[PDB]
Design a binder for this molecule. Structure first.
Ligand SMILES: CCCCCCCCCCCCCCCCCCCC(=O)O[C@H](COC(=O)CCCCCCCCCCCCCC)COP(=O)(O)OCCN
Ligand SMILES: CCCCCCCCCCCCCCCCCCCC(=O)O[C@H](COC(=O)CCCCCCCCCCCCCC)COP(=O)(O)OCCN
Ligand SMILES: CCCCCCCCCCCCCCCCCCCC(=O)O[C@H](COC(=O)CCCCCCCCCCCCCC)COP(=O)(O)OCCN
Ligand SMILES: CCCCCCCCCCCCCCCCCCCC(=O)O[C@H](COC(=O)CCCCCCCCCCCCCC)COP(=O)(O)OCCN
Ligand SMILES: CC(C)CCC[C@@H](C)[C@H]1CC[C@H]2[C@@H]3CC=C4C[C@@H](O)CC[C@]4(C)[C@H]3CC[C@]12C
Ligand SMILES: CC(C)CCC[C@@H](C)[C@H]1CC[C@H]2[C@@H]3CC=C4C[C@@H](O)CC[C@]4(C)[C@H]3CC[C@]12C
Ligand SMILES: CC(C)CCC[C@@H](C)[C@H]1CC[C@H]2[C@@H]3CC=C4C[C@@H](O)CC[C@]4(C)[C@H]3CC[C@]12C
Ligand SMILES: CC(C)CCC[C@@H](C)[C@H]1CC[C@H]2[C@@H]3CC=C4C[C@@H](O)CC[C@]4(C)[C@H]3CC[C@]12C
Ligand SMILES: CC(C)CCC[C@@H](C)[C@H]1CC[C@H]2[C@@H]3CC=C4C[C@@H](O)CC[C@]4(C)[C@H]3CC[C@]12C
Ligand SMILES: CC(C)CCC[C@@H](C)[C@H]1CC[C@H]2[C@@H]3CC=C4C[C@@H](O)CC[C@]4(C)[C@H]3CC[C@]12C
Ligand SMILES: CC(C)CCC[C@@H](C)[C@H]1CC[C@H]2[C@@H]3CC=C4C[C@@H](O)CC[C@]4(C)[C@H]3CC[C@]12C
Ligand SMILES: CC(C)CCC[C@@H](C)[C@H]1CC[C@H]2[C@@H]3CC=C4C[C@@H](O)CC[C@]4(C)[C@H]3CC[C@]12C
Ligand SMILES: *[C@@H]1O[C@H](CO)[C@@H](O)[C@H](O)[C@H]1NC(C)=O
Ligand SMILES: *[C@@H]1O[C@H](CO)[C@@H](O)[C@H](O)[C@H]1NC(C)=O
Ligand SMILES: *[C@@H]1O[C@H](CO)[C@@H](O)[C@H](O)[C@H]1NC(C)=O
Ligand SMILES: *[C@@H]1O[C@H](CO)[C@@H](O)[C@H](O)[C@H]1NC(C)=O
Lengths: 344, 344, 344, 344
């Protein structure tokens, strides 16, 4: 039913499932905006496919040819099925709009499924190629941040009663390499191109005259070519073509609204803001150097992933509340850190 | 069946599922009133869609055109399907009420699903954008309250046998920022606007003459335009239009009753009452300062979320019972706290 | 099938599911009588809806109009569907009993579902508004009782080898407030009113002549108004109306039997008997004062909830067996308590 | 539905399920490229089979023979079923394209399923024959790497405050044996051959005239051979043949794109690059000798499997970050290793 389709595709965790494995425990591995874009671009065409053939919206068979009254039920069924299979056969049918509109009307669900698959492909490539590496690197970075926070609080407590910036060096090294950012931009660009092509196709499909679904059909090949009792042609109409056009314009609207989001996603350096690591600069055990901005490198992408999935880090949360309290400046950062006692 | 739909949509945890993740363990992340509003506004139109096409209420096909007796079964089926697809084609049909009523009668389930999706969108945006931040902040606040309660009871026990207000400073800082409250008000306002538009549409749909479902249909395009055996027109009726109007007025009543709730929700500062933190003011380790009221800021929203999901805090429950006992004043707050022995 | 519906709605845990959350572990949060009343009042109309359209009891379509023999199958189907949709349209049909009986016959499942939803609403309001508070308070009370029992047995063992009545003070304070009892009485009263209205409706529906299901139908609007081959009217009958009346009288009987139960529930103070706390009065560490009776206050409701869900408390069970043994008076209460050794 | 098939076969973990057993905990046991190739080559033909007979794309029965009007419904059904079963019987039917096109049109789903099974066979043979051995060997290798890393860090810590290369000897021994690599190459080659044969078949099927689906059928064997009322022949058409050809060309495109991937897979030594063990050469406890390249031996395959599933090793990750930091050369490898403190 329509409501069942809605529950499956919008109100359920459709493509929102976290990786089912212990390797990525709590790691999104995909930005929220990218996940939203993929979920829409994939589950919208599927939802429209399901809707267009819902038991309520669908009168019945997808084509009716209006055989003569003399024709029996199965003769008329032969006519309808023959014309359905003959939309491909150009000789059989003669339609003013041509044969491409008939092809599109017959295979619209296939085309929507193709667009959905093509849009799901780049996210899958990301999740299967560049996701494990970033997951491992980010897990190491979070562990290093937790360890340095613990060491700093232990030092502060000892004072009240190595020291090498490994994480900073690793981030600096990531500043050079750009394979991950190149893959990310390539997959986003392919998604954008697929969306644009889908918009072109949907606009063309919705621009039809709405009468191209009605085509003339001739079961006059073979032994029936010179038969007399059979009329030379029939009036066939492809039902649900109006529904297809409505859903196609809906998908076109959604995709044109979505494309600016993908374009904004492509410009990762601009998105790289609100320095996540700036909060850690007040730790004595952490060097006061952010050095993450203004670069078409994997460092900006790692900064984005950190700003996305750093809320799970207790040390980061503690430092964030310390920073927020520092806005008033009533107290002192080391005193607040010592009082917090948030090692684990 | 009707009962199955009821069980799925009203008697089950439809959209009442808690976040399936360890990050939010026991945190609602959504006020009870907001959750009720979203659940109604989403699962009502879906329930009505399912009901309108239930196997019992539905006689059968959604349109019947009453072809002549001479017409065969599949000729009549062609007529019915053609008219169903031609509700869009204005030339084919001539109805007194126009063609918009026919469009609405055909696509009412789609319109209800659209309203449900549009009403579910703002809650989803909230849960995916502003929910993680408030979850982390509120978890930190609850942990700080538990820790300060433990410290105060330990101090009292030591007396019988830092001290910095970090949580108060954090709340004071939240008094300034307003991004969360702005997002909350924006999503509530969008929900209200969607509800009002849905009410307008449902009122218009229910105001129809009830005879607009009957339209005249002409299969007279193409080779059949000059055919003689076919009548110039047919009498088609869209079945289930009365059911659609009944369910639309039901939804209109529900939404007009719900809109005052959304308006009351918009005025968060008025809702900010029954100070949750007032109970903690009797703790020696906690400063006697509430400072949370009369502000279009995130502080009021945090106060609401606390008053919502603070019952899970054992220290808060203990302080609440101490406060309630203090109404008589027979005993002493520190003595009762020491006797409680409710560290964990 | 009928047996499947029975298993789902009477032999299964339909609305008998305990709260699926760790917050309420073993707490009913709903009295047994109230749960029975809600389960009946909700799952009876749903069961009757399912039964009335069971594949065995149902001959087929819900209306047959007996078109002339000259009419084709789909002409007759048009007639039947038109009349089904025209039960609303007063002009189309002319029935002796009127049009309200036809409306009721068509929408009886909707009306039963409406009554079920309206009866499920007050229980849901209770469980979502006043259940968390009573759950927290009752959990605290049980914990306090366990702690005082442990302290008393420890004192007895020490003798053989604070002391403040916090729980008693909390109960005394609950004696004043009445918001919970007011909500309980309001929800019970609304349930009773809904049940009475349902009884009125079912009595009216069952009082019909049983021939109102037969109505005269006229497909004579539009181009067919002046058509000659079509008869001026048809004889239509709404099938399953007898089944609807039978199930409606069954529901009426059940609801009239149930209403006295709801009225008895409304009088909570009378139900407040068999003092649960009287057993704890023999503990040296517990003050000898019950002070819970004869009040339209939340104290009586808390006493009811205690008498309901106190069997899970080992200390209460031990004290109850001590009390039962004290009926003979052969031994001594402190000696029996010491010998029991039931700390945990 | 189409969307359901898509969710099952592309958006779900179809053939992506990890081995359901504790023996292989986190071990892929199959390269990512090989898994992708198998998943495509298997779930594409299945998806196309499901699509070709979807309730929306399918008009109805797969063959209609257009019996005379005098023929009754079940006479026409006999004709259609007889011709469907007589596509095999060459005498019954006379088609210009022959009888092989009819066989293919009737059994296209069977042929796609056969290709899917044949392509799934080599992966299954691998997973059931050569997977346990490589799993055990690789688990031992990872355990040895973890142990040597722990020993080296312990030695470094002791300095700050056996020694036999068992793993290197085992890898060197693997350099000689080649049974695993021979099995891998054989299964890949069989997969490639199956893909090529499938491409040949699909090209032949798509190269048909598109009118071979129309064949002449004669129910003139037995008592009906000399019957007069029955026409000497009928015009039968195999519906869905156009859909079969479309999906066959789609599968052909996918397989021709995939075959280069399989050919690249066959050349494992070229794939053996980015020495995984080179990072471990900086450990004092590990001998400075990689000795893994330029060989048609199991050593290259083991190197590939290591580069695939070594990210799960904490010691390897630590050494990798040490290597990346060494690019700048600011610090010292032993000092960084000591500071890391990443034993477990
Ligand atoms: C994806 C979207 C593809 C849509 C665009 C396809 C480009 C077609 C260009 C060729 C057109 C062509 O040959 O001309 C028409 C015939 O088309 C044809 O006979 C070819 C029809 C094109 C194929 C449409 C079917 C798409 C199936 C998708 C399946 C995906 C499934 C994946 C799981 C003639 O007619 P006319 O009207 O152009 O001219 C008639 C008067 N000059
Ligand atoms: C959402 C609710 C939308 C309802 C309001 C739509 C505004 C329509 C304004 C244009 C009306 C128009 O062009 O005039 C009518 C034709 O309408 C048309 O032909 C356009 C019909 C409007 C589209 C209705 C279909 C809604 C589909 C929703 C799908 C959602 C799915 C999402 C998953 C003519 O006839 P007349 O009677 O106005 O005048 C006839 C005598 N002057
Ligand atoms: C709930 C139970 C509601 C039953 C009582 C409804 C009160 C009806 C009062 C108005 C009656 C009225 O206007 O008069 C009749 C027409 O009724 C009408 O045309 C109005 C019919 C009333 C609506 C019945 C449909 C209930 C649908 C419930 C849907 C719930 C779904 C929720 C998920 C005329 O005929 P006559 O025989 O009275 O007089 C004919 C000779 N004077
Ligand atoms: C796998 C793909 C197999 C396709 C290629 C099969 C090779 C056929 C070679 C023999 C052809 C033959 O005997 O000649 C035709 C008859 O074919 C026949 O009667 C034999 C038809 C071949 C069998 C096709 C059915 C495949 C079933 C697959 C089932 C798999 C299920 C596994 C779970 C005559 O006609 P003509 O047109 O060639 O010449 C007619 C004018 N000279
Ligand atoms: C997804 C991508 C590939 C879709 C590409 C656009 C498709 C949908 C449409 C939009 C405009 C279309 C073209 C418009 C006009 C003509 C001229 C005609 O004589 C042959 C077909 C041809 C050349 C059409 C082919 C298909 C076409 C290119
Ligand atoms: C992503 C955005 C830009 C998509 C917007 C849809 C655009 C591309 C659509 C809307 C209307 C469409 C046109 C409608 C009609 C025709 C006439 C036909 O003979 C050739 C294609 C052509 C010229 C279409 C090309 C694509 C088109 C311009
Ligand atoms: C969800 C929102 C967009 C719904 C908006 C209201 C819809 C349901 C209805 C209510 C009143 C309607 C209008 C009433 C009168 C007319 C005048 C007519 O000559 C053209 C259509 C037009 C202009 C209608 C368009 C659709 C309309 C605006
Ligand atoms: C949220 C609340 C205010 C909704 C209440 C429903 C209101 C808006 C409904 C009920 C009846 C409706 C009217 C019924 C009939 C017509 C005549 C038509 O030619 C234009 C629209 C118009 C004038 C409708 C406008 C909207 C309307 C006034
Ligand atoms: C659930 C509640 C609202 C049900 C209320 C009772 C319903 C079922 C029935 C019982 C008696 C009925 C009334 C009996 C007699 C008449 C007089 C007639 O000229 C108009 C309808 C009217 C006024 C009926 C309206 C519906 C009615 C009130
Ligand atoms: C909860 C208990 C009291 C319910 C018992 C059912 C009662 C209320 C039912 C049973 C028979 C019913 C009556 C049957 C027939 C008529 C005649 C009609 O023109 C008006 C309503 C009226 C007068 C009904 C009113 C309600 C009624 C009296
Ligand atoms: C999967 C593998 C086995 C498929 C092999 C190719 C199949 C699909 C096709 C492609 C070309 C075909 C051949 C083309 C021409 C002829 C000559 C004819 O007089 C007899 C059949 C015969 C000999 C065909 C047999 C089947 C054939 C070999
Ligand atoms: C893996 C790649 C190379 C597959 C490409 C498909 C090739 C092999 C296909 C496409 C068109 C096909 C040809 C189409 C028509 C005929 C005529 C027939 O009487 C014999 C087979 C023959 C000659 C086919 C042989 C196979 C063929 C050449
Ligand atoms: C049909 O009859 C015509 C008469 O002109 C002839 O040309 C044609 O070949 C016949 N077709 C068949 C299939 O026998
Ligand atoms: C139908 O016949 C009329 C006669 O006036 C003619 O004008 C029209 O073009 C014909 N239509 C078709 C589709 O042949
Ligand atoms: C039907 O014919 C009658 C004859 O009196 C006429 O008044 C009426 O308008 C006609 N109806 C239609 C719908 O043409
Ligand atoms: C049909 O009749 C013919 C007449 O020539 C005869 O040869 C043939 O054997 C008969 N067939 C059967 C099955 O009786």
């Amino acid at each position: 039913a329509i409501a069942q389709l809605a529950t499956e595709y919008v109100f359920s965790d459709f493509l929102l499932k976290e990786p089912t494995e212990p390797k990525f425990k709590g790691l999104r591995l995909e930005l929220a905006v990218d996940k939203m874009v993929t979920c829409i671009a994939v589950g919208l065409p599927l939802l429209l496919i399901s809707l267009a053939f819902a038991q309520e919206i669908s009168i019945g068979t997808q084509i009716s040819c209006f055989s003569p009254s003399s024709f029996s039920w199965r003769q008329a069924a032969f006519v309808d099925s023959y014309c359905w299979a003959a939309v491909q056969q150009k000789n059989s049918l003669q339609s003013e709009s041509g044969n491409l509109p008939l092809w599109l009307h017959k295979f619209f669900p296939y085309i929507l499924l193709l667009f959905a698959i093509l849009l799901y492909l780049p996210p899958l490539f990301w999740r299967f190629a560049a996701a494990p590496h970033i997951c491992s690197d980010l897990k190491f970075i979070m562990e290093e941040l937790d360890k340095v926070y613990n060491r700093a609080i232990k030092a502060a407590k000892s004072a009240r009663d190595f020291k090498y910036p490994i994480v900073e060096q690793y981030l600096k090294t990531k500043k050079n390499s750009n394979n991950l950012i190149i893959k990310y931009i390539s997959c986003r660009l392919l998604t954008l191109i697929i969306i644009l092509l889908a918009c072109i196709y949907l606009g063309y499909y919705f621009s039809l005259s709405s009468l191209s679904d009605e085509f003339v059909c001739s079961i006059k090949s073979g032994i029936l070519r010179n038969d007399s009792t059979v009329p030379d042609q029939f009036q066939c109409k492809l039902i649900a073509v109006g529904i297809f056009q409505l859903l196609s314009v809906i998908n076109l609207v959604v995709y044109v609204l979505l494309a600016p989001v993908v374009v904004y996603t492509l410009f990762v350096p601009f998105r790289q803001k609100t320095d996540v690591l700036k909060v850690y600069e007040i730790l004595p055990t952490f060097d006061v150097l952010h050095f993450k901005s203004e670069g078409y490198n994997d460092l900006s992408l790692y900064n984005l992933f950190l700003e996305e999935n750093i809320s799970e880090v207790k040390s980061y949360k503690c430092l964030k509340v310390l920073e927020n309290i520092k806005s008033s400046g009533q107290g002192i950062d080391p005193m607040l850190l010592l009082t917090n006692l948030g090692m684990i």
